[PDB]
């Protein structure tokens, strides 16, 4: 087992793939690609994407190798440091069909990931999902099974303003303050919600589940995040980097000032 | 009679508007002859208390002759409810004369020696001729000597921790004798109570006042700014560039014990500044600043003692006393602990074995007490930038600049 | 905090001083105040301001001068001595009892400030206390007294949000 | 449906670069639309290059007189004038490779990062973009600031178009102010004149709309748990640097166009981006540090 | 010939300025095949006057790069052995021996007409790059095998070393009870803060001071 | 029978020829293949496993241990519990180790092939990585306990270790002390806000599933309306 | 030395033609010149080496040379007690010998204290093979030198390492401004002189 | 699941089987929470009989600690070394949940451990079993724990549980109308200087027009 992190970058590269597929052909059609990215370790990170060229003979979807080989020469002149992590495709469940294209892409890497998307889905979170192939020994037979992975969104500071400069799509200190007011109304309507499910639990109006108010205690327990001395240490010294710059921030508008008075006090009397 | 005609009129034009009018029937004097000039004192306070009787007050307090009156007793008592009730703004119309009344009641008081007597009032009148705290009037000078000669210097201390931005110009008048005067007293009065840097800030702006001739107050304000800086600094400060250039070429020459004493004391060497104010103990006791002299040479110990911490991080008390010329284990010991509680020194006694100890400043800026002396460092800077944003606006909508 | 508030009154009485000269109960517990608030600058120029007749024909004031002067000395032994050799009718007693408790929290903050190891005759000396007195009371604390080499070891003692946005709001105006 | 601007008319395209109205007027293309897939990746690849500059093309069409950006892919391109000619063959075959998997939008235009010191073009930046107007006509270039995006939370992009050597154009120099450099100023203020700057504009299909919609509800979390005074930490001490010398240069000046408000406008930038920072910081600490019993 | 005679004679005329540093730099590129001055200078006053105004001057990568490691002086510190030994001595931080030589050639260096009034300062600032050197890889020290390491006792190395110390020169503490020179390097984040307050507290002040003097001038404010 | 005679073969030398991986490999090649008697495959597995010792640590040996980790059948292995250490990197004790080696055989089993045993260095240094992990600062007489080898064993592989980049840290001779990677406190609070957090969102999408709609969609409209 | 390599390697090819008994000393001169340099990677894997190197008139040497690029102060030193009469005899070996033995335990040392941050005297004298007193004299040779980038706690006897590197970018920035702001602040208030 | 096939095995079962399988629940390693199996009635129906220690042994499995079961080993019944190592798991995850940085001393005395080397190999056991993870620092002998289980919780902890999650959302609040009165007064102070400015623009540009006449 490994631990997956997804940058929105792939995603929205399997979201463009798909919408053009979709109004060059006029109808929905699936789209296939690859996912690449770095593995340390146990920790893999899927951070690029590129489309792959598959061909559909018969009832069955082949995948072009020699295509795939020159864009993986094609990106590895501009990525150096990035490897063939797997490949994705859009639909619901796994088909028999994604098995089919996974032991294709097997030949092709050892471990391959299997990314799989929902453009028609009626679910309120993400649906992205991400899955590994095992080989099972089921009635003396080989067959290759996906098991789901848990993926996080990997965080990088640009990608996140450019997802939210993308997502939002519209003083210095309001426009500052509404990238903060929007996660903490997010972070208060969770707390809040979980507050009231805890709520009616307690009085009764739920089922009483004994996990979810054991994983509520230790969510409460995790507050206060982190007040070791040393933390505050290094707060104050954050505190007072930033109230050193802003005293010489204020220092040179001051002097600023002073030289438009001082010029203008030249001009009207007369020195 | 002409005077009651003329308390007619000042009571038809009070309570009518027209102050110009008010003022310049006031100024129309030289009838006050007649010496019942107290009957028409108390016909006119009823309505609007106290603009009138403020030209009278005056004429009995320019009388020459002193105040007849028991000592001066009444004209005191007068004066002293007039400054208690003269309800502001009226008397800022003719504000020489109020500024010349409370000149000659200073004047009066020390001649007869009871400065304290007039400390309280002169706190009356200024915040009620003054348009805002920030303005300095020739009553200023007046509170900062009465506060002098009486020793009460606690009073006079709301009034000298303003930083004054505009200055009362009191219908002509306002000499530079009361700029220099006052800020030759404060510095004196920050001397005394041992507010050295703003002593020397007060000193500092004395010698600065643009000047043709020599000045009394300048020259001894420049004479008592070396030593100060001699206490706060290890050093003279170097004045500014643009004072005027009298005190270089008159004043210096004419501070030549000072600049003597501040040359020996550049020399660590304390024998040498106690032969120096020993020579010159005839200059410093007529200048009557003695004892200010020897605050430097108790300061030159302070400094010597705060060279150790540069160069020794453990010394022992009878070489540190070596090093001082203290002459003495018991001395440097007790000179480190009058520093250590002073706070002029962070350092430990350990009398095990003698050795004083030199420590680093304990201080790390990782605390929010650092935050919050940032913080109103920062306060000063922004309110310092507002006034100088509004001088600057005032001056732009000037008829004047916009035509040039 | 009645300390401050006397000090207030009595430096408004003696600025409204009916002839520029206060009465000598004021004065006294003035100079005593200003004692207790260690502020000696004040309390000096009090001492000269005073009238000399006044001095004259109230000794009082010259007990509570020489405590000053003791004070301005910085010794310790001459307050302590100089305290407990006077009284009056309870108007100076109060604050110079309590002058005597400042002085002593004022001699043990120095001397554990300022001290690494401080001898046991000193540092009774300084808190006024006879010496195992003052050796024994230091218990709780933990100052490591020792015996024989009689050497005490002295041991040493929101709105952040709206002040950022004032910030940034005087930066970019 | 916001999904028209994805579909490709092949003969809308080919009827419009025969038609060719640019090369009549001269401020022909006034506004410039960027997809959000575009934009990300061109974020993503200046961020990656560090310090260094980074270059590649973007793929579009041209649309009555604004230019549409589809994608953008990285160049292995390492001043130079056009520097995209020592990887034609690289250009070559993506655009084949892309063909094959239906990208059927041509190179529209070449984006390069200006780390750290703003969005505009150089010397060699008007050169390559008048060169490219010429023969690779209609171009537009696309100047992005990894560096100043992560500092000031915005994204700092900006689409040019050069002017003909030989063509003096009426003024239009309103000179929105931008912090550039010491030693990047002087380039600046003489290349100002010889390009003028696209409105920038962008957009996403349903898809990207939706899956964006979904993403946030768990992508809130980095938002609330980043701090911006630790990753561009490096680029406020440059910053300070280069303001402590234009500060020589006013100081020098006041001895003798009023440098000092352009230093203070410069220090306010830097410092107001320090408390935004620190901002987040005491927000954080408020939220999260304050729930002790 | 001539090339050697106009470097010999500008590093003498430089020398004679009390510019040691381009002395040594000049009489360094001196020929020893080309040395023969009756009038101007002998082989052996050239190599002392270089190999003292280099010891004195010279940091350790110059000393190494134009006395030590050059084959074009090499020759020249083959006539005086003991100027060879002083210098080869310091760079291998032999200091002792070297200053006890120093010191036996003191008394003939001050019968020599050109260098008598140099040698005093020459030996003072030998000597203190030599303090400067023995405790450069230190971060504490002994003040003994120190003061061993001089020809000083322990109280005359307190003397040299907090003068030393005071000037700048060596940024160290010495601790008189244990006696030893402990250094202290730097608190450069306490550092700027002191400096950035005072510059601040400095503005204000001079920032009132010129507003007092504003309204100085405003109100035509002089002494007549 | 047919071919995978000689695979065997072929995998038994590659064995004896020390050619750990490649025989890895083909050793669960043919753990898959259907056409042998079921136990044998067992067999095969096992011997892919028992290259835990026959392997030198990289990127290729890495890959193999993942994928017989993901392997339900290796459960069944008495090397399983070597494993499932070596890929999780976790702490392997000397009992283990010992009896790990007790199922080996004298090929495999190397005795010196480099000094002291090729074995033993390799676990010595496996458990000072995993060591790395579950330690801010370790001494010596400490981690030499830890991994059953001498302090001054321990110092030297450690320092040794250190230099040649395969660990973080860095060596006070005078406490004793290794020090790994520092984890300053202001990155651990975000860190730690942001697995906060992700509590949250998990707590949130549980709530959802295990009652859905009812008090979930119930009061997500109540807030939102 | 890169000169002497050189011209001993030219000898060594030329000399072949002539006298007998001053071709092994002239390899080993040669041998000696390439690793003085500590830059030359040139033992007896050369094809030209072959007639005069696997003959073994001489084999001190070529061990010597390997212990040299291997830095083994131990096979080093061993080489110089066991096989001796063929290196210490000659003269023109011997005085180069102390200058090649400091370059190997200065290559060993820079490679001892890289892991640590603070490392006794005791331990680098126990390493080296060599007494504190020289280890010491090596230590302020190298920081001298910037070779060790670390200083000597002489009370206590031990070498610590610069590995902390706090910014000072940020402060080095800050301080620059502010005596800009020290500067530019004068010269505004100047100009209502 | 682990705890519920157990759960699955206690439907009918009472009496000495009942008991039985409580001692197997206790040592069968994976399982940490025991909540659910507690609250069946037919496990709640032991505390009267001979097997009521049993149940109140699941208790101290499930709410108590190590301490509380050294101050009543004479009551429970005799742990097993593998359910005193889980007992003993139980109370490193109990001292975590109120301290993120648990000092060595406090780990030594309520666990009853020997020396260093033996609390450690506990703390990596149980950091192996995933119930904590954290990080040892042996020089300042402490245990800062980042992740930790949630134990059991008895229906008097659900109170806290409401507290903690109120005060939160106060919290959470009173930071967003911050926020919002912050922005409002920038605004105020961007309009307000924007104001000024052209109120003296005007001002000038009045003057400047009377000055043509
Ligand atoms: N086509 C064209 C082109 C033109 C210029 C550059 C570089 C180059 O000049 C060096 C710094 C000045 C500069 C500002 N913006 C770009 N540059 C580059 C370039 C871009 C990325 C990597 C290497 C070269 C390409
Ligand atoms: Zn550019």
Same mark, same amino acid.
């Given at each position: 087992?490994?631990?997956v992190?997804l940058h929105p970058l792939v995603i929205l590269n399997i979201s463009d793939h798909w919408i053009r597929m979709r109004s060059?052909?006029?109808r929905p059609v699936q789209v296939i690609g690859?996912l ?10 899927v951070?690029?994407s ?37 490949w994705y495709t859009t639909g619901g469940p796994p088909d028999?069909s994604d ?14 990931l299997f990314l799989k998307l929902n453009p028609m889905t009626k679910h309120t979170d993400l649906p992205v999902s991400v899955f ?14 996906f098991?789901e992975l848990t993926y996080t969104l ?9 997802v939210?400069?993308v997502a ?104 | ?63 020459? $002759? ?249 010394? $022992? ?88 | ?173 | 449906s916001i999904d028209?601007?994805y ?14 109205? /640019? ?11 960027? @997809?959000a897939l ?71 235009? /070449?984006?390069? @990062? ?5 969005? /505009? ?5 008007? @050169? ?76 996403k299909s349903s898809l990207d709309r939706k899956l964006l919609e979904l993403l946030w509800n768990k992508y /809130? ?28 240069? @006013? ?43 | ?224 | ?200 969102n998990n707590?949130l999408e549980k709530?959802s599933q295990?009652?859905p709609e009812?008090?979930a969609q119930?009061?997500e ?5 | ?193 | ?213």
């Amino acid at each position: 087992s490994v631990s997956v992190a997804l940058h929105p970058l792939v995603i929205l590269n399997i979201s463009d793939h798909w919408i053009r597929m979709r109004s060059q052909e006029g109808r929905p059609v699936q789209v296939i690609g690859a996912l690449i990215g770095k593995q340390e370790g146990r920790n893999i990170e899927v951070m690029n994407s590129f489309e792959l060229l598959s061909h559909t003979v018969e009832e069955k979807i082949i995948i072009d190798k020699e295509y795939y080989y020159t864009k993986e020469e094609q990106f590895k002149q501009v990525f150096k440091e990035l490897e063939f992590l797997g490949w994705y495709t859009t639909g619901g469940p796994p088909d028999p069909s994604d098995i089919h294209v996974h032991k294709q892409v097997c030949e092709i890497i050892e471990s391959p990931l299997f990314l799989k998307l929902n453009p028609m889905t009626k679910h309120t979170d993400l649906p992205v999902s991400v899955f590994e192939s095992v080989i099972d020994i089921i009635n003396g037979e080989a067959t290759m099974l996906f098991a789901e992975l848990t993926y996080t969104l990997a965080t990088e500071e640009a990608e996140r303003i450019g997802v939210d400069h993308v997502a939002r799509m519209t003083s210095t200190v309001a426009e500052h303050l509404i990238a903060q007011h929007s996660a903490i109304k997010m972070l208060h309507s969770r707390v809040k919600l979980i507050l009231e499910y805890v709520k009616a639990s307690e009085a009764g109006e739920v089922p009483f589940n004994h996990e979810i108010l054991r994983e509520a205690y230790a969510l409460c327990h995790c507050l206060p995040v982190l007040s070791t001395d040393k933390f505050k240490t290094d707060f104050y010294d954050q505190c007072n980097d930033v109230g050193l710059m802003a005293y010489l921030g204020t220092i040179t508008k001051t002097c600023n000032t002073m030289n438009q008075f001082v010029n203008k006090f030249n001009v009207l009397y007369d020195r | 009679s002409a005077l009651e005609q003329f308390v007619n009129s000042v009571r038809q034009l009070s309570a009518q508007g027209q102050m110009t009018q008010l003022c310049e029937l006031i100024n129309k004097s030289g009838e006050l002859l007649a010496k019942n000039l107290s009957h028409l004192d108390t016909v006119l306070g009823a309505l609007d208390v106290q603009e009138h009787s403020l030209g009278v007050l005056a004429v009995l307090f320019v009388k020459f $002759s002193m105040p007849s009156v028991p000592d001066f007793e009444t004209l005191f008592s007068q004066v002293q409810l007039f400054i208690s009730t003269c309800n502001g703004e009226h008397i800022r119309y003719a504000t020489d004369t109020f500024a010349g009344l409370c000149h000659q009641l200073t004047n009066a008081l020390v001649e007869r020696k009871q400065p304290l007597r007039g400390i309280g009032i002169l706190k009356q009148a200024i915040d009620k001729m003054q348009m805002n705290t920030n303005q300095l009037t020739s009553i200023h000078a007046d509170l900062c000597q009465l506060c002098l000669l009486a020793k009460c210097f606690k009073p006079a201390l709301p009034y000298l921790d303003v930083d004054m931005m505009d200055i009362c110009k009191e219908n002509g008048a306002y000499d530079a004798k009361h700029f220099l005067c006052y800020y030759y007293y404060g510095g004196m009065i920050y001397t005394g109570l041992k507010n050295f840097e703003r002593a020397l800030y007060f000193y500092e702006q004395a010698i600065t006042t643009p000047a043709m001739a020599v000045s009394h107050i300048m020259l001894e304000s420049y004479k008592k700014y070396i030593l100060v800086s001699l206490i706060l600094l290890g050093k003279v400060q170097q004045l500014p560039k643009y004072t005027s250039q009298i005190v270089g070429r008159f004043i210096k020459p004419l501070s030549n014990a000072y600049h003597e004493l501040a040359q020996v004391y550049s020399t660590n060497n304390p024998s040498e500044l106690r032969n120096l104010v020993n020579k010159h103990s005839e200059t410093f006791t007529r200048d009557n600043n003695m004892g200010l002299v020897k605050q430097c040479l108790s300061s030159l110990y302070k400094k010597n003692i705060q060279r150790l911490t540069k160069t020794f991080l453990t010394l $022992s008390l009878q070489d540190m006393a070596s090093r001082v010329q203290l002459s003495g284990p018991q001395e440097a010991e007790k000179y480190v602990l009058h520093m250590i509680e002073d706070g002029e020194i962070f350092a430990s006694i350990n009398q095990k074995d003698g050795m004083v100890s030199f420590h680093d400043n304990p201080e790390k800026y990782n605390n929010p007490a650092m935050l919050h002396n940032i913080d109103q460092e920062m306060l000063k800077c922004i309110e310092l930038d507002e006034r100088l944003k509004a001088m600057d606006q005032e001056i732009t909508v000037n008829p004047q600049f916009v035509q040039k | 905090f009645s300390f401050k508030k006397l000090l207030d009154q009595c430096e408004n009485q003696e600025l409204e001083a009916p002839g520029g000269i206060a009465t000598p109960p004021v004065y006294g517990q003035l100079l005593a105040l200003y004692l207790l608030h260690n502020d000696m600058n004040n309390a000096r120029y009090l001492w000269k301001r005073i009238p000399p007749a006044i001095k004259s024909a109230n000794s009082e004031l010259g007990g509570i001068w020489s405590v000053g002067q003791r004070i301005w000395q910085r010794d310790f032994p001459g307050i302590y001595t100089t305290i407990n050799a006077h009284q009056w009718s309870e108007t100076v007693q109060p604050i110079m009892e309590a002058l005597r408790d400042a002085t002593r929290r004022r001699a043990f903050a120095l001397v554990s400030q300022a001290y690494t190891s401080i001898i046991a005759d000193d540092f009774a000396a300084f808190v006024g206390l006879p010496v195992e007195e003052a050796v024994k009371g230091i218990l709780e604390q933990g100052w490591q007294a020792d015996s024989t080499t009689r050497m005490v070891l002295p041991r040493k003692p929101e709105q952040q949000l709206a002040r950022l946005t004032d910030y940034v709001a005087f930066l970019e105006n | 449906s916001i999904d028209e601007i994805y579909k490709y008319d092949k003969k809308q395209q080919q009827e419009i670069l025969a038609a060719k109205p /640019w090369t009549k007027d001269h401020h022909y293309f006034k506004y410039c639309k960027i @997809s959000a897939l575009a934009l990300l990746k061109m974020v993503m690849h200046a961020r990656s290059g560090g310090n260094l500059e980074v270059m590649g093309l973007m793929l579009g069409k041209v649309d009555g007189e604004t230019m549409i950006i589809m994608d953008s892919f990285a160049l292995p391109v390492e001043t130079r004038v056009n520097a995209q000619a020592a990887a034609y063959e690289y250009m070559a075959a993506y655009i084949e490779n892309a063909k094959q998997v239906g990208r059927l939008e041509n190179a529209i235009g /070449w984006y390069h @990062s200006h780390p750290g010191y703003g969005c /505009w073009l150089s010397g060699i930046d008007v @050169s390559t973009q008048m060169l490219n107007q010429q023969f690779q006509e209609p171009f537009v270039a696309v100047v992005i600031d990894p560096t100043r995006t992560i500092s000031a939370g915005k994204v700092n992009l900006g689409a040019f178009r050069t002017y003909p050597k030989g063509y003096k154009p009426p003024d239009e120099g309103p000179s929105e102010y931008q912090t550039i450099p010491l030693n990047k100023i002087e380039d600046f203020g003489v290349h100002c004149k010889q390009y003028y700057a696209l409105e920038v504009s962008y957009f996403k299909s349903s898809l990207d709309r939706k899956l964006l919609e979904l993403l946030w509800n768990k992508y /809130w979390v980095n938002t609330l748990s980043s701090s911006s005074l630790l990753t561009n930490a490096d680029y406020t001490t440059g910053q300070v640097f280069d303001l402590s010398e234009k500060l020589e240069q @006013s100081e020098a000046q006041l001895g003798r166009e009023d440098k000092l408000a352009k230093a203070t406008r410069d220090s306010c930038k830097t410092t107001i981006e320090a408390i935004h920072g620190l901002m987040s910081q005491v927000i954080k600490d408020k939220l999260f540090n304050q729930i002790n019993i | 010939a001539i090339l050697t005679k106009l470097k010999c004679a500008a590093g003498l005329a430089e020398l004679a300025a009390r510019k040691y540093k381009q002395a040594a730099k000049c009489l360094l590129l001196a020929s020893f095949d080309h040395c023969d001055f009756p009038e101007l200078l002998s082989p052996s006053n050239v190599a002392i006057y270089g190999g003292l105004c280099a010891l004195a001057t010279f940091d350790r990568q110059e000393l190494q790069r134009n006395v030590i490691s050059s084959s074009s002086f090499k020759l020249f510190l083959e006539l005086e052995p003991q100027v060879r030994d002083i210098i080869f001595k310091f760079y291998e931080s032999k200091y002792a021996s070297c200053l006890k030589m120093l010191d036996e050639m003191k008394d003939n260096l001050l019968l020599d007409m050109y260098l008598a009034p140099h040698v005093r300062t020459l030996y003072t600032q030998i000597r203190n790059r030599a303090l400067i050197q023995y405790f450069s890889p230190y971060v504490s020290a002994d003040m003994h095998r120190m003061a061993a390491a001089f020809n000083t006792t322990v109280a005359a190395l307190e003397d040299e070393l907090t003068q030393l110390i005071l000037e700048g020169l060596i940024s160290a503490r010495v601790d008189s009870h244990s006696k030893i020179l402990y250094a202290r390097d730097v608190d450069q984040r306490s550092t700027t803060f002191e400096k950035s307050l005072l510059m601040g507290k400095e503005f204000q002040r001079r920032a009132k001071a010129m507003m007092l003097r504003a309204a100085v001038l405003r109100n035509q404010i002089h002494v007549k | 029978q047919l071919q995978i005679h000689y695979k065997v073969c072929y995998a038994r030398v590659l064995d004896y020829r020390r050619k750990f991986i490649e025989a890895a490999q083909r050793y669960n090649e043919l753990s898959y293949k259907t056409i042998v008697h079921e136990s044998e495959r067992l067999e095969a597995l096992k011997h892919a496993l028992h290259c835990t010792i026959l392997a030198s640590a990289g990127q290729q040996r890495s890959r193999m241990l993942a994928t017989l980790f993901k392997d339900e059948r290796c459960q069944q292995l008495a090397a399983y519990g070597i494993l499932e250490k070596m890929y999780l990197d976790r702490i392997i004790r000397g009992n283990q180790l010992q009896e790990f080696a007790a199922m080996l055989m004298p090929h495999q089993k190397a005795t010196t092939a480099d000094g002291s045993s090729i074995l033993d260095r390799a676990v010595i240094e496996h458990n000072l990585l995993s060591a790395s992990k579950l330690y801010n600062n370790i001494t010596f007489e400490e981690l030499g306990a830890l991994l059953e080898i001498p302090a001054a064993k321990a110092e030297k592989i450690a320092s040794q270790m250190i230099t040649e980049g395969r660990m973080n840290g860095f060596i006070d001779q005078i406490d004793g002390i290794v020090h790994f990677e520092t984890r300053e406190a202001l990155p651990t609070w975000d860190k730690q806000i942001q697995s906060l957090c992700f509590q949250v969102n998990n707590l949130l999408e549980k709530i959802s599933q295990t009652a859905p709609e009812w008090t979930a969609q119930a009061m997500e409209a109540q807030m939102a309306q | 030395f890169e000169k002497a390599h050189t011209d001993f390697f030219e000898a060594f090819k030329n000399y072949d033609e002539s006298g007998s008994p001053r071709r092994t000393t002239c390899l080993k001169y040669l041998v000696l010149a390439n690793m003085l340099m500590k830059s030359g990677i040139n033992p007896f894997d050369s094809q030209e080496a072959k007639p005069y190197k696997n003959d073994p008139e001489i084999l001190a040497m070529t061990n010597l040379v390997s212990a040299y690029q291997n830095n083994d102060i131990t096979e080093f030193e061993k080489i110089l007690k066991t096989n001796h009469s063929n290196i210490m005899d000659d003269p023109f070996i011997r005085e180069h010998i102390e200058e090649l033995l400091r370059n190997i335990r200065t290559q060993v040392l820079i490679k001892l204290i890289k892991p640590y941050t603070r490392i006794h005297i005791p331990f680098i004298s126990k390493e080296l093979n060599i007494d504190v007193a020289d280890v010491e004299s090596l230590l302020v040779q190298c920081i001298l030198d910037n070779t060790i980038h670390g200083r000597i706690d002489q009370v206590n006897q031990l070498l610590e390492l610069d590995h902390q590197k706090r910014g000072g970018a940020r402060y080095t920035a800050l301080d620059k401004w502010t005596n800009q702001l020290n500067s530019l602040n004068q010269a505004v208030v100047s100009k209502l002189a | 699941n682990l705890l519920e096939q157990f759960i699955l095995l206690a439907k009918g079962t009472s009496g000495s089987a009942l008991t039985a399988l409580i001692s197997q629940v206790l040592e069968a390693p994976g399982v940490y929470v025991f909540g659910e199996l507690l609250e069946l009635a037919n496990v709640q129906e032991l505390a009267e009989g001979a097997n009521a220690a049993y149940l109140q042994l699941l208790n101290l499995f499930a709410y108590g600690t190590y301490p509380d079961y050294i101050a009543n080993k004479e009551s429970l019944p005799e742990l097993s070394t593998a359910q005193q190592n889980k007992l003993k798991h139980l109370t490193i995850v109990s001292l975590a949940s109120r301290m993120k940085c648990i000092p060595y001393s406090v780990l030594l005395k309520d666990l009853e451990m020997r020396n260093l080397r033996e609390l450690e190999d506990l703390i990596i056991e149980a950091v192996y079993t995933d119930i904590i993870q954290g990080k040892l620092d042996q020089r300042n002998q402490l245990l800062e724990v980042d992740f930790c289980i949630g134990r059991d919780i008895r229906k008097k902890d659900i109170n806290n549980i409401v507290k903690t999650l109120h005060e939160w959302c106060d919290g959470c609040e009173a930071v967003l109308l911050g926020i919002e009165q912050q922005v409002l007064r920038a605004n105020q102070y961007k309009e307000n200087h924007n104001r000024t400015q052209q109120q003296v623009e005007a001002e000038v540009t009045n003057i400047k027009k009377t000055l043509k006449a």
